[PDB]
Structure 1
Amino acid sequence: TCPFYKKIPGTGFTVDAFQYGVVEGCTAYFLTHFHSDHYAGLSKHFTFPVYCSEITGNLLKNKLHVQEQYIHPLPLDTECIVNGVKVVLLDANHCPGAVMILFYLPNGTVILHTGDFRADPSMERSLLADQKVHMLYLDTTYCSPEYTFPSQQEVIRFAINTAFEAVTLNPHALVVCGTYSIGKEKVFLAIADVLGSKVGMSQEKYKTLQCLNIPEINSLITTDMCSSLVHLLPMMQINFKGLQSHLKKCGGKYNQILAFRPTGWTHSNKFTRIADVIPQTKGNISIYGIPYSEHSSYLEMKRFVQWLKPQKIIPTVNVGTWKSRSTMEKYFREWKLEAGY
């Protein structure tokens, strides 16, 4: 049944709750972003109001065929009224179109639901600075001190320098980047920009990117693989067998692959700096696992929460085991005693 951490008290609303059938008493279903564990359940047969960003609404219409009459896109950073309740959508710094949702309950309680997010100090200067938040529904994906990772900027500098050096040493090398969802577009787009190429991809993936309002996108992507030396493939195909097979398909245009897998975290982060990352190599194929995250590190999460000073935290991730729940609650208490709220 629908878990409590998906329901907004004092309203008829749910967040990211499309796989439970008709949730009894729900008048408005919000969707924070277009990732499958969150939209699971939506289709052209859904007939209740969906509230979301413009970009998420484009993806609902074009990829899932949800009918337009049930899609209610909202502008960001703007006070809107939904079924009698004031709400605001804020940028979550996750994937394109991903939002956090502020709810102003009729009784005076203010609730922030982060959806999935990568906390950032810029958020301390949004509409969040303007009133107190009582209850925080928090993306706790990486809520343990072992999870450190570099800035997105550091990771993209590493990827651009590596790709440019490889292709300038060997003009017959192909660059391949893995994907299985929206998000992390800066990885492949930055590499294509330094090489003077478009990114080549499947018709399905091209359609997805064309829903994202990214400026000048017609100038950066293409379905013509032959004209491109940066190819996007499914993440599953980013292994030696999959890559050797792809190289066969290019008809001797290329003699080497350099491949990137933008993972979240991997335990090479508890030891290794970004400067010190090395690939797995077999023959003329090299694979680089790079720690490009669209979720908060532990320290980013901790800073955001100690700034916001909520009265109550409701985790939304890692909630399925008692040891994970109890560990997170211990961190929340440490943070509150350190900061004095």
Structure 2
Amino acid sequence: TCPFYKKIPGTGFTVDAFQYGVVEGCTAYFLTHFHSDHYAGLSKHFTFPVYCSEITGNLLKNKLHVQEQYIHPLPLDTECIVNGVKVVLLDANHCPGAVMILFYLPNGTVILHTGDFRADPSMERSLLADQKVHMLYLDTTYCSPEYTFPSQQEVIRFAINTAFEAVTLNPHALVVCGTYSIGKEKVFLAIADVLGSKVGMSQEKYKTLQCLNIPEINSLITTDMCSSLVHLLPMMQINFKGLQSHLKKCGGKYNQILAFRPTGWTHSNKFTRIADVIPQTKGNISIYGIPYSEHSSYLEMKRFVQWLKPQKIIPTVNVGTWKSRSTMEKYFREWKLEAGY
């Protein structure tokens, strides 16, 4: 049964609630983004209206075979009426196609559902600037002050400089990047761009990327692995055994692998600066874990909330333990006392 924090009061709507069967009272199912913990349950046999971004709706039709007549894509930054309720979709700064949803309830209440997001000061000048928000359904993934990480731009600078040095030292080095979902495409695209190469990958992953409306993509990716020196592999294969096996398959074209695992946070964040990050090495294989996050840090989250000044916060992540829930509530009260709302 569907948990309360997936239900929008005063409407017929749910958010990211496809694994519960037919939800009683639901007339429209919203999907914030195409990540499996959120789409779990969708398939070609789904026959209720699904509301989403254009990019999410391309992935629904092509990857999950949802029939077209049930996909209702909405443009971003545009007031739309759904089953008699005004809604707006906003960019969530998460993975491609990911949105936050503003609901303007018939009684005057305004609710923001962040989906998954990485808060940014640019959001303070979207359509959120223009009215009061009463209730915030908040992505609390990293809601504790230990969670610090660098900007995406610093992490990509590290990656490009590391790859360009290695390959200029050794033109027979292969670069490998791990993936298991959409998101984080800048990692492998920025490295292929500095090297003058396309990114090579499986037909299944090429198919996924072709649904993303990324400009000039035909110029940047390929299924011809032999023509590429940046390869994408499943995240599970980014270990010394998996990479040794891959290097065998390349037929003596290469004699070294430099590999990247874009993690979110890891405890090596609490001690070490990005500049100081080092790989794990075995023979001619090196693996870098790089802290490329598509979720808010603690400080980014706190800034957004202190700017928005909601009357009520409903966390959507870390809600399964009493210790987590008590920790989050304590920070919410701090933020409200410091800012004065």
Shorter-chain TM-score above 0.5: yes
C-alpha offsets along residues 89-120 of structure 1, whole Å, 9 cap, x if unaligned?
A: 00000000000000000000000000000000
Q: Deviations over 1:135-167 (max 9, x none)?
A: 000000000000000000000000000000000
Residues 290-324 of structure 1 deviation map (CA, whole Å, 9 limit, x = unaligned): 00000000000000000000000000000000000
Cα distance in 1 between the residues matched to 2:266 and 2:276: 14
Q: CA deviation at 1:33?
A: 0.1
**Match of 1:29, SS?**
strand
Gaps in structure 2 of 5+ consecutive residues: none
What CA distance in whole angstroms lies between the structure 2 residues aligned with 1:289 and 1:234? Answer: 15
Secondary structure at the counterpart of residue 226 of structure 2: coil
Deviations 1:262-296 (A, max 9, x none): 00000000000000000000000000000000000
Q: Distance in 2 between matches of 1:205 and 1:269?
A: 30
CA distance in 1, matches of 2:287, 2:162: 12
Residues 50-75 of structure 1, C-alpha deviation per residue, up to 9 Å, x if partnerless? 00000000000000000000000000
**2:38 match:** 38
Please name the residue that 1:294 is paired with: 294
- CA distance in 2 between partners of 1:72 and 1:107 (Å): 25
Deviations 1:24-73 (A, max 9, x none): 00000000000000000000000000000000000000000000000000
TM-score normalised by structure 2 residue count:
1.00
User: Runs of at least 4 residues of structure 1 off by over 4 A?
Assistant: none
Q: Distance in 1 between matches of 2:89 and 2:52?
A: 8
CA drift of 1:199 comes to 0.1
Q: Secondary structure at the match of 1:51?
A: strand
Give the secondary-structure state (helix, strand or coil) at the position aligned to 1:47.
coil
Task: Give, in whole Å, the separation in 1 of the partners of 2:26 and 2:62.
Answer: 25
Task: Give the 3-state SS of the residue equivalent to 1:226 in structure 2.
Answer: helix
TM-score (norm 1): 1.00
Q: Report the number of matched residues.
A: 341
Match of 2:127? 127
Q: Distance in 1 between matches of 2:270 and 2:169?
A: 32
Deviation at 1:229, TM superposition (A): 0.1
Give the distance between the partners of 1:326 and 1:51, measured in 2 at CA: 33
How far the C-alpha of 1:87 sits from its partner, in A, is 0.0
Secondary structure of the 1:14 match is: strand
**Gap runs ≥5 in structure 1:** none
Cα displacement (A) at 1:78: 0.1
Secondary structure (helix, strand or coil) at the match of 2:225 reads: coil
Q: Deviations over 1:226-283 (max 9, x none)?
A: 0000000000000000000000000000000000000000000000000000000000
Counting aligned pairs with the same residue, the percent is 100
Q: Secondary structure of 2:147's partner? A: coil
* Alpha-carbon distance between aligned partners in 2 of 1:160 and 1:91, rounded to the nearest angstrom: 26
CA shift at 1:171, angstroms? 0.1
The 3-state SS of whatever aligns with 2:10 is coil
* Matching of residue 186 in structure 1 with residue 214 in structure 2: no
Q: 1:161-310, aligned counterparts within 5 Å?
A: 161-310=161-310
> Offset at 1:188?
0.1
1:219 Cα deviation from its structure 2 partner = 0.1
Residue 18 of structure 1 aligns to a residue in which SS? coil
Deviation at 1:130? Answer: 0.2
Structure 2: distance between partners of 1:253 and 1:271:
38
RMSD: 0.2
Question: In 2, Cα distance between the equivalents of 1:129 and 1:5?
Answer: 25
C-alpha distance in structure 1 between counterparts of 2:333 and 2:270, whole Å:
24
